Amino acid sequence: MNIFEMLRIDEGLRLKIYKDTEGYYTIGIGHLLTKSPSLNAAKSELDKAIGRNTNGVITKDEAEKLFNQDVDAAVRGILRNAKLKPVYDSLDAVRRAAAINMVFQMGETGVAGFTNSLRMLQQKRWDEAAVNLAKSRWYNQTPNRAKRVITTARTGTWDAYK
């Protein structure tokens, strides 16, 4: 199990524009296209992203290219962030996949926001961090995925995904 397989489980794969849990226009593997209500703005962003006229539909390959860019952007975003970087450096490779999951789903800014949890993670206070992470809109909004991520952080094992 790795970060790519973990995310593919959590986000699914969809070849046609769709709406996320929050209601945003998304495509492929969790790739947020826009927060704008227009399905036309979405189609617009979509073709810009792919480099062709898609009419809201893409191939598996295309979807895979997008996913590769986003994980890379997630990682680089973590490494470039003054709040995130130290937590990350401090962690083992499984736990690291967990911070990467979060950043991919809620953006660098969001996660950088989780001040307290971050501090507990760095101090390697697992249980307490787990509890604190659950006291969030994130957890309330998508609880089954959040539980899986939270367990990965608390444990350093891939249990929740096996």
| 4 labelled ligand-binding | no
Q: Which of 49, 112, 130, 149 binds Cl ion (CB under 5 A)?
A: 49
CA–CA gap between residue 104 and residue 73 (Å, rounded): 8
Stretch touching Cl ion by CB under 5 A, among 39-47, 75-83, 120-128, 142-150: 142-150
Q: Which residues are annotated as catalytic? A: 11, 20
Cβ pair 103, 127 in contact under 8 A: no
Instruction: For the chain, give percent helix, strand, coil, nearest 5.
Output: 65, 10, 25
Q: Which of 145, 150, 152, 160 binds Cl ion (CB under 5 A)?
A: 145
Which residue has tokens 């957890």? 139
Both structure tokens of 119: 């501090």
- By CB under 5 A, tell whether 43 contacts Cl ion: no
Bridge partners, residue 26, by sequence = 18, 32
If the CB atoms of residues 22 and 89 are measured against Cl ion, the closer one turns out to be 22
Contacts of 37 (CB under 8 A, 6+ apart): none
- By CB under 5 A, tell whether 144 contacts Cl ion: yes
- By CB under 5 A, tell whether 142 contacts Cl ion: yes
In angstroms, give the least distance from the CB of 38 to Cl ion. 18
If the CB atoms of residues 9 and 79 are measured against Cl ion, the closer one turns out to be 9
If the CB atoms of residues 13 and 123 are measured against Cl ion, the closer one turns out to be 13
Strands 31-34 and 25-28, bridge-based pairing: antiparallel
- By CB under 5 A, tell whether 78 contacts Cl ion: no
User: What does the binding site for Cl ion look like in residue numbers (CB under 5 A)?
Assistant: 49, 142, 144-145
